[PDB]
Amino acid sequence: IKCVVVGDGAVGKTCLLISYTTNALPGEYIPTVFDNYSANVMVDGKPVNLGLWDTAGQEDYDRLRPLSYPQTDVFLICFSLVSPASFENVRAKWYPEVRHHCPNTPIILVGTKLDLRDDKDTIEKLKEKKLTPITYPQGLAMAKEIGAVKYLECSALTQRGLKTVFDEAIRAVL
Numbered sequence: 001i002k003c004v005v006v007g008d009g010a011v012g013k014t015c016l017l018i019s020y021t022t023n024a025l026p027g028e029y030i031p032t033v034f035d036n037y038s039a040n041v042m043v044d045g046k047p048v049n050l051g052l053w054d055t056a057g058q059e060d061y062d063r064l065r066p067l068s069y070p071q072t073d074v075f076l077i078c079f080s081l082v083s084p085a086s087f088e089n090v091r092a093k094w095y096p097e098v099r100h101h102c103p104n105t106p107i108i109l110v111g112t113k114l115d116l117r118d119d120k121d122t123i124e125k126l127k128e129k130k131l132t133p134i135t136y137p138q139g140l141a142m143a144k145e146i147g148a149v150k151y152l153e154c155s156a157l158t159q160r161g162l163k164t165v166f167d168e169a170i171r172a173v174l
């Protein structure tokens with residue numbers, strides 16, 4: 001099965017795949033040009049081979065990113081639950097660019113950095129920008145908007161809700 005991970009620069013796409021496959025969060029930040037991980041999971045009582053395609057976040061790779069999209073079974077659209085810009089760009093940039101090349105591929109909306117949503121350290125940082133974190137009901141609505149099959153929230157650090165992301169991704173194609 002083919003799964004493409006798409007979202008704004010520095011939302012936690014890479015981390016979300018490395019923590020899921022290896023159980024270790026990278027201590028340093030290195031921007032993804034392109035990678036290709038895989039994982040053998042057993043769900044629905046079925047042997048499942050899953051290929052995960054990490055992409056780039058910048059507008060630099062605009063016309064080189066869509067190359068990955070053909071022959072895809074399911075998409076993940078990601079955004080930081082702390083970064084509201086990335087929440088906007090779902091509808092603004094990613095939902096257009098995706099449905100443009102693939103108008104049938106089921107989508108799953110994903111709120112990353114779930115641990116930091118309740119963190120007072122971040123809350124009073126974003127307060128200075130007169131902005132709140134994205135509540136669950138808000139993503140729930142953004143999911144309905146872009147016609148996603150599911151909406152899920154997870155932290156790659158604490159691995160909270162992380163298995164489900166890929167449980168639902170597979171369940172979408174099955």
Ligand SMILES: Nc1nc2c(ncn2[C@@H]2O[C@H](COP(=O)(O)OP(=O)(O)OP(O)(O)=S)[C@@H](O)[C@H]2O)c(=O)[nH]1
Pocket residue numbers: 007008009010011012013014015016026028029030031032033055056057058112113114115116154155156157158
């Ligand atoms: N607290 C917390 N921090 C996270 C989480 N996921 C990612 N981060 C932090 O955010 C930064 C970006 O992670 P990364 O996975 O590189 O994003 P990306 O979207 O893949 O990066 P890019 O390919 O668009 S340039 C990292 O420094 C990481 O420590 C998370 O679940 N919880």
Ligand SMILES: [Mg+2]
Pocket residue numbers: 013014015031032054055056
């Ligand atoms: Mg990346």
